[PDB]
Design a protein around this ligand. Structure first.
Ligand code: ADP
Length: 429
């Protein structure tokens, strides 16, 4: 097999992981971003070079494929040569545009129809600049960074391109969009993991990389995190028990529900759907520090219900599994015993995950087969028991959770595992 390099540019820093997949060995390096910047592109690019520099020379001489994940909806408006013409619009920033202005360019309830989408941001830039030059380009963070390595302009992947208006189901931008004032700025879209081009000669020599090293189409940090688990059978899921509960479910068919923010990414011959609740670990942290979560959790017997019926929102408003912007946290009655209170909370969170996966199924997704767990709550075995009892499928801690590692797997193996040849055997004599 191959020594491959994955680069993860996330919300607060970047990480690089190089893996020798025959020896199953690896090296990891990282850089931390400032909270603010006058020149984010400079920060990101310098981070890229820092990461490469930190990798030992002998590893660098062996890297054959490279891939990059970036944050979703972080975009840059660049000239022909890839120089940013204005500040980037970050993944979390929303644009004050009329979504009706986009209606002719994507299907109804397409995921791009959101004030934070790459498409919303390109349109905002169009209105702000008046008329965008056709030789210019819009690039996602991942796009721009890989451009620093392979020199090929206007290149993206069908994960990052989704919220720019790509329709992975028909593998195209709508003709209406391509023919519009914005068409000339759109990227050519490839499958994540496919080789875009060889590394730039000068970059290869500067950093001691093979000049035959290939740079692959990238992905988003969220998807990269899913790729880290190794899951590739429809029905397999990764639950992230973090500040919020985030569900990702591998499915044979695409599902969507704009009301609850549910949409699907293409993933080889399959689809990755999911959803994000406002409930999660942040609610727990409002009441208990991690050490207390531990010390109290081991006093809980999950085989006996608490009698408490909580909905553990950290504040007003729920998004998923069921949308209600007015929904109140339901945290009463609060019993005297903190152990029982914590059990009530864990039971509530468990209901959020249970209803979440069952909901995805009810929208048409492949029925849940098993769950891999990531995030701060993953090692809570009492919570794991409650979840297993409520959901009725095997649950375990994900083998790997690092987005950089998922992206390294993407560089090494692409999306080959995500096709029906790998399904469970049904052969019987
Ligand atoms: N033993 C535990 N059981 C349940 N939740 C925990 C435990 N330890 C930490 N957490 C929760 O994990 C959350 C942070 O998860 P993490 O994924 O590390 O951060 P983030 O979600 O912000 O990326 C915190 O809100 C904390 O309450």
């Amino acid at each position: 097999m191959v020594v491959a390099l994955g680069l993860d540019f996330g919300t607060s820093g970047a990480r690089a992981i190089a893996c020798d997949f025959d020896s199953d060995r690896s090296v990891s390096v990282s850089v931390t971003f400032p909270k603010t910047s006058q020149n984010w592109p400079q920060v990101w690019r310098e981070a890229l070079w820092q990461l490469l520099t930190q990798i030992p020379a002998d590893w660098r001489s062996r890297i054959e494929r490279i891939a990059i994940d970036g944050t979703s909806g972080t975009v840059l408006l660049c000239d022909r040569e890839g120089q940013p013409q204005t500040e980037p619009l970050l993944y979390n920033q929303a644009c004050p545009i009329d979504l009706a202005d986009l209606a002719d360019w994507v299907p109804a309830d397409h995921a791009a129809l959101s004030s934070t989408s790459s498409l919303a941001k390109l349109w905002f830039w169009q209105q702000q600049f008046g008329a965008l030059p056709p030789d210019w380009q819009i690039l996602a963070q991942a796009d721009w960074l890989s451009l620093q390595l392979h020199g090929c302009s206007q290149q993206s992947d069908y994960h990052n391109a989704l919220k720019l208006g790509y329709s992975p189901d028909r593998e195209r931008f709508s003709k209406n969009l391509l023919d519009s004032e914005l068409g000339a700025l759109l990227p050519v879209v490839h499958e994540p993991g496919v080789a875009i081009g060889p590394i730039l000669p000068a970059i290869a020599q500067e950093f001691g990389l093979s000049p035959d090293c290939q740079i692959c189409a990238g992905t988003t940090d969220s998807i990269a995190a899913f790729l880290a688990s190794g899951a590739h059978q429809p029905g397999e899921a990764v639950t992230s028990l973090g500040s919020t509960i985030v569900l990702k479910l591998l499915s044979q068919v695409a599902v969507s529900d704009r009301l609850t923010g549910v949409y699907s990414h293409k993933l080889g011959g399959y689809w990755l759907t999911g959803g994000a609740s406002n409930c999660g670990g942040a609610t727990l942290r409002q009441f208990f520090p991690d050490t207390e979560l531990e010390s109290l959790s081991c006093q809980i017997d999950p085989t006996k219900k608490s009698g408490l019926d909580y909905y553990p929102l950290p504040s007003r408003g729920e998004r998923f599994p069921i949308a209600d912007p007015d929904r109140l946290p339901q945290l009463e009655p609060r019993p005297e015993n903190p152990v029982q209170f914590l059990q009530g909370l864990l039971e509530g969170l468990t209901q959020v995950e249970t209803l979440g996966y069952q909901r995805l199924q009810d929208l048409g997704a492949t029925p849940l087969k098993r769950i891999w767990t990531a995030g701060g709550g993953a090692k809570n075995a009492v919570w794991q028991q409650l979840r297993q009892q409520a959901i009725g499928v095997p649950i375990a801690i994900a083998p790997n959770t690092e987005a950089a590692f998922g992206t390294a797997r993407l560089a090494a193996f692409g999306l080959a595992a995500f096709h029906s040849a790998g399904l469970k055997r049904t052969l019987e004599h």
